[PDB]
Design a binder for this molecule. Structure first.
Ligand SMILES: CCCCCCCCCCCCCCCC(=O)SCCNC(=O)CCNC(=O)[C@H](O)C(C)(C)COP(=O)(O)OP(=O)(O)OC[C@H]1O[C@@H](n2cnc3c(N)ncnc32)[C@H](O)[C@@H]1OP(=O)(O)O
Ligand SMILES: [Zn+2]
Ligand SMILES: [Zn+2]
Ligand SMILES: [Zn+2]
Ligand SMILES: [Zn+2]
Lengths: 287, 290
């Protein structure tokens, strides 16, 4: 169905994280770190590791199973407008049917040719920052991009969950890499030579370091998108307003831009609980 | 104030500087002297050390040039004089203040407008943007034939830097390709324990990975600009085709594949692979297809 093959990237990430939990706790902390009796380190890593581990898997879970938000029923063509639009043959006259409907909706953007943004498949008038996804077969409010590593679209409901998933990916990889670093050296100078545990300790430092540098660019890109209040699509095709194209049409200042996604309640900023302001169908404009 | 912000822009170049200085120490001292030369192969050592230095000097020369070549800014002809800028600041009508820019544009070689048929004007610099020129908020200036603000060089890629930036990507691939190709033979052996220099293990293995990660990364970045040069498009223009008097046209500056490359590298073949300024034009006006 193509759905099944879509669950392959998440199974890979699941096994790599499951392997990292067994490798970091069993092979590294119990066999290696506890094997040389260094006072006060085995416990302080296990409590900190579990703390990073739960935040990583909880944010990753939310990004996967948080269904993407769709436009409300107000943006769908009524039976009167959907009929006349389907039967109208002149492209000029069918545009007026969409334009009159757009006056009753909070729509401030148009196509590149000054055309009312309309989705022929869903038979609805696309709201601002909303785009149709051929994988999800639905319009996604404030669609950022379809992330294949979570088998879901990153939209208005997912965005803050996706960003935290990146951040906790960085800290989980940074913590593992920085803590395994001191013991990755000892197996090479041959202070330790455990045949049963050497192989697991090495990959931890390489897999965590190769994933750290990978998502780090992905994390820096979105820190710059959020400050500018742009989605991944808007960075490549800026939305067109009445006064022309403007890639900063939705910007409200770097401080207020972040709060549009994270909210004003500070107790939900770092937790993967929906705290994004607004409804996803309409967004404050700069002008 | 800005001591924290302006200095943090130099962090990406100091990171690459340390990676390169280390790669020089890792390839010459640890690999060629300690690893390769300890293995009774003085023929491969000297041929590598000179081949490495040839790529190393071309790599750092292009890198330095893309950094310290300041981007081109508009000339005083495009600035609004104190007479024209006075009447514009006082005007409140949108079309009447636009008429001010229209008569001024009849004296400038400008063939592009905005997507909404408006004269490209810059409120911060108080000038009329030349063609292909754009304003950079990081540089706080207008940049002639601006491509993109590449943070890894802490500078704008514009009309004067572009060839240096392109050669900096070319020599990065070759510097990484040469290292990846040469360290490959000795990378496999250390995993089969075929050699054991406790001190050489750390540098030789990191050499292969660091050079392999950078190669595959900049390979896409290098491939994107080779298309831009052939189409005579900047990065900004690949996102939004410019609009001329006859409408939007992504190939409005295209003069053919061969003639577009010479626009950046020049007609003198001796300057093609050298990071010395050889780009055609003045940056304020460019030949159009029509
Ligand atoms: C072994 C040792 C080897 C070492 C070897 C080292 C190798 C070294 C590489 C290492 C690893 C890198 C490999 C991966 C690469 C990355 O990690 S980073 C990828 C970044 N790629 C880029 O191209 C940089 C783009 N960054 C920008 O800021 C661009 O200018 C953007 C995308 C256009 C956005 O700019 P901005 O946010 O608007 O900021 P600003 O400075 O104000 O620029 C504004 C101008 O852009 C224009 N603009 C903005 N948005 C748009 C748009 N959607 N459409 C058209 N125009 C736009 C504005 O209109 C404006 O122009 P005007 O019309 O006003 O005059
Ligand atoms: Zn749709
Ligand atoms: Zn999708
Ligand atoms: Zn400017
Ligand atoms: Zn710049």
């Amino acid at each position: 169905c193509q759905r099944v093959v879509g669950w392959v990237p998440v199974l890979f990430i699941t096994f790599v994280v499951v392997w990292s939990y067994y490798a970091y706790v069993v092979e590294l902390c119990v066999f290696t770190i506890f094997g040389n009796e260094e006072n006060g380190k085995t416990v302080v890593y296990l409590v900190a590791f579990h703390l990073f581990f739960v935040m990583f898997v909880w944010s990753y879970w939310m990004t996967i199973f948080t269904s993407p938000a769709s436009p409300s029923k107000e943006f769908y063509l009524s039976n009167s407008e959907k009929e006349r639009y389907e039967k109208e043959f002149s492209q000029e006259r069918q545009q007026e049917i969409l334009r009159r409907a757009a006056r009753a909706l909070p729509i401030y953007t148009t196509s590149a040719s000054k055309t009312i943004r309309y989705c022929e498949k869903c038979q609805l008038i696309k709201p601002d920052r909303a785009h149709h996804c051929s994988a999800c077969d639905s319009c996604i409010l404030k669609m950022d991009h379809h992330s294949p590593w979570v088998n879901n679209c990153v939209g208005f409901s997912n965005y803050k969950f996706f960003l935290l998933f990146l951040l906790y990916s960085l800290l989980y990889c940074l913590f593992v890499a920085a803590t395994v670093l001191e013991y990755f050296i000892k197996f090479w100078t041959n202070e330790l030579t455990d045949t049963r545990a050497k192989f697991h300790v090495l990959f931890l430092f390489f897999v965590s370091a190769m994933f750290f540098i990978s998502v780090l660019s992905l994390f820096s890109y979105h820190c710059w998108l959020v400050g500018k209040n742009r989605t991944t699509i808007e960075s490549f095709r800026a939305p067109t307003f009445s006064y022309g194209p403007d890639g900063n049409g939705f910007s409200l200042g770097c401080s207020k831009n972040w709060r549009q996604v994270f909210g004003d309640e500070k107790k939900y900023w770092l937790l993967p609980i929906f705290s994004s302001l607004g409804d996803g169908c309409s967004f404050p404009t700069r002008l």
